[PDB]
Amino acid sequence: AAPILFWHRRDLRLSDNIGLAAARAQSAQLIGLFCLDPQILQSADMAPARVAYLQGCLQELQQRYQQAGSRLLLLQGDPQHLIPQLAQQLQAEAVYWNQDIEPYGRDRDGQVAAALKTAGIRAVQLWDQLLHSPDQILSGSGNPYSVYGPFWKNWQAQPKPTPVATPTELVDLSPEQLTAIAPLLLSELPTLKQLGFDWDGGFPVEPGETAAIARLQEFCDRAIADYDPQRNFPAEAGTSGLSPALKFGAIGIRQAWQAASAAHALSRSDEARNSIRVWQQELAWREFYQHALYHFPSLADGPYRSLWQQFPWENREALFTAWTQAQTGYPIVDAAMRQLTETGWMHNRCRMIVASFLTKDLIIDWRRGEQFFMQHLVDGDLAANNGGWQWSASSGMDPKPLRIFNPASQAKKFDATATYIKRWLPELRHVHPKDLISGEITPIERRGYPAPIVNHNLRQKQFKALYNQLKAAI
């Protein structure tokens, strides 16, 4: 008959889904689909933890569609070829999907839409992963924001959208329709191993829409009240752990905002009020970087500001390798890099410390780090990851005066008792917190733990010197 296809990408859930809800208001014969795109799966920048989480979200999505009344079609190959072909073989009334903010997703999308138009099939692309689309947040001159302050002021005043309905009572495809598309479908969802990946490090939140919704609710029912200042300490489990759920859309952005907003109204404590407002602003910061990537795609290429595109990066491979293997000799840095490679996630404060270290101390083009994070983070997200790294050098959006972190100061300030350090570096559990924080560990009491690969003070003078020299040469 007249079926509508909904194409899932970073919105692996049936609830609070803008494009999916819009599609259901047009037809009950709503068939979901996911395409295993080789340019994404085979990329050297794909993290095993991310594929594991992804695959897990899909397993649940298959069930959700089955329970709703239809199914989730699985495809493997090039999207602009396979999707139009599938829609045509199914005489699809339309193909729906939620818009991307990334260069690759957007280029692919324009190509799929054009192919659909040629075939005479409607393509509806709606905004779903942002509370406010990039086109809704503009300055008085109708231009995007490259400074957070003014962006936050606009974003904050905009009326917030609420969760949309979960589609129900769907009409599944018939055998004759299934025969028409048989050649384009995978019989079943490939396992992690079949895809050639392996992951056993766990997740910040179990895969799937259900687990994501449970975490959001558990966080907003208690821990969120102490977000500020518990968010600052890596040793403390004071954050939500929803990052991969937001990147892959296991949780909708409006459900998250609403749950936090309801907790704020329910709270009668000032401190709890503040903590919740702070968490909410985290979501605003997320949108700032996503809108930035949308408005200024060249950000993805590397250092944005002119001065930084010329910075003389030393690029000593040995130093980078030591960094990636947690063998830098700086406890707070190695404990963090170990948490990343072992669990596929890293506390935000630690991401800031290790990024600053790689860029300021090791003086390595931060792109090597941005790539290493993407190769390991279960929440690896271009907008946020690139935003985080441009930040380590003020080479992109919302720049700040030159500054260099001192691992020792950070460690003492955010891990004063060295609980997080000993947790991820158990072979140093015998050392005094004082020494793990300063990074000055006696050879005998250090065992096999390596000595500092660089002398912070000398690296700091070297970085500033290169900065001032180029600063002048311009």
**Residues labelled as active-site residues:** 282, 285, 313, 348, 366, 389
Interface residue with ligand FAD, options 99, 240, 258, 280 (CB under 6 A) = 240
Q: How far is the CB of 138 from ligand FAD (least distance, A)?
A: 20
Q: Round to whole Å and give the CA distance between 129 and 83.
A: 22
Q: Which long-range contacts (CB under 8 A, 24 or more apart) does 336-341 make?
A: 336/234, 336/424, 338/424, 338/425, 339/424, 340/373, 340/376, 340/377, 341/376
**Beta carbon nearer to ligand FAD, 231 or 456:** 231
**Of the ranges 131-139, 282-290, 292-300, 432-440, which one interacts with ligand FAD (CB under 6 A)?**
282-290
Q: Please count the residues of this chain forming the interface with ligand FAD, following the rule CB under 6 A.
A: 28
**Beta carbon nearer to ligand FAD, 330 or 373:** 373
**By CB under 6 A, is residue 259 in contact with ligand FAD?**
no
**Beta carbon nearer to ligand FAD, 27 or 129:** 129
8 A C-beta contact, residue 439 and residue 331 = yes
Range 314-373, binding ligand FAD (CB under 6 A) = 348, 351-352, 355, 373
**Beta carbon nearer to ligand FAD, 189 or 283:** 283
**By CB under 6 A, is residue 292 in contact with ligand FAD?**
no
221: enclosing H helix or E strand: helix 209-221
Interface residue with ligand FAD, options 104, 148, 152, 285 (CB under 6 A) = 285
- At which residue do the structure tokens 């490679």 appear? 341
**By CB under 6 A, is residue 388 in contact with ligand FAD?**
yes
Q: How far is the CB of 74 from ligand FAD (least distance, A)?
A: 26
Interface residue with ligand FAD, options 384, 428, 431, 441 (CB under 6 A) = 384
Q: How far is the CB of 234 from ligand FAD (least distance, A)?
A: 10
**Of the ranges 16-24, 62-70, 378-386, 457-465, which one interacts with ligand FAD (CB under 6 A)?**
378-386
Q: How far is the CB of 245 from ligand FAD (least distance, A)?
A: 7
Interface residue with ligand FAD, options 243, 255, 275, 375 (CB under 6 A) = 243
254: enclosing H helix or E strand: helix 253-266
**By CB under 6 A, is residue 239 in contact with ligand FAD?**
yes
CB atoms within 10 A of CB 150: 12
Relative orientation angle of helices 148-157 and 270-295, to the nearest 10 degrees: 110
8 A C-beta contact, residue 151 and residue 145 = yes
- Name the closest residue to ligand FAD (Cβ): 388
**By CB under 6 A, is residue 220 in contact with ligand FAD?**
no
Q: How far is the CB of 385 from ligand FAD (least distance, A)?
A: 3
Q: Round to whole Å and give the CA distance between 323 and 277.
A: 35
**By CB under 6 A, is residue 381 in contact with ligand FAD?**
yes
**Residues of 124-143 as b/e, b for ≥16 C-beta within 10 angstroms?**
bbbbbbbbbbbeebeeeeee
Q: Round to whole Å and give the CA distance between 134 and 334.
A: 37
**By CB under 6 A, is residue 380 in contact with ligand FAD?**
yes
**Complete edge-to-edge strand list for the sheet that includes strand 122-126:** 72-76, 30-36, 4-8, 94-98, 122-126
**Of the ranges 88-96, 163-171, 311-319, 383-391, which one interacts with ligand FAD (CB under 6 A)?**
383-391
Interface residue with ligand FAD, options 101, 130, 319, 377 (CB under 6 A) = 377
**Beta carbon nearer to ligand FAD, 96 or 227:** 227
**Residues of 364-394 as b/e, b for ≥16 C-beta within 10 angstroms?**
bbbebbbbbbbbbbbbbbbbbbbbbbbbbbb
**By CB under 6 A, is residue 254 in contact with ligand FAD?**
no
**Beta carbon nearer to ligand FAD, 79 or 380:** 380
First to last CA, the chain: 66
By three-state DSSP, how is residue 75 classified? Answer: strand
Largest pairwise CA distance in the chain: 76
Q: Round to whole Å and give the CA distance between 40 and 31.
A: 23
**By CB under 6 A, is residue 291 in contact with ligand FAD?**
no
**By CB under 6 A, is residue 286 in contact with ligand FAD?**
yes
Q: How far is the CB of 231 from ligand FAD (least distance, A)?
A: 6
**Beta carbon nearer to ligand FAD, 86 or 220:** 220
8 A C-beta contact, residue 201 and residue 49 = yes
The upper half-sphere exposure of residue 288, i.e. CA atoms within 13 Å in the direction of its Cβ, equals 24
Contact positions vs ligand FAD (CB under 6 A)? 231, 239-243, 246-247, 282-283, 285-286, 289, 348, 351-352, 355, 373, 377, 379-381, 384-385, 387-389, 391
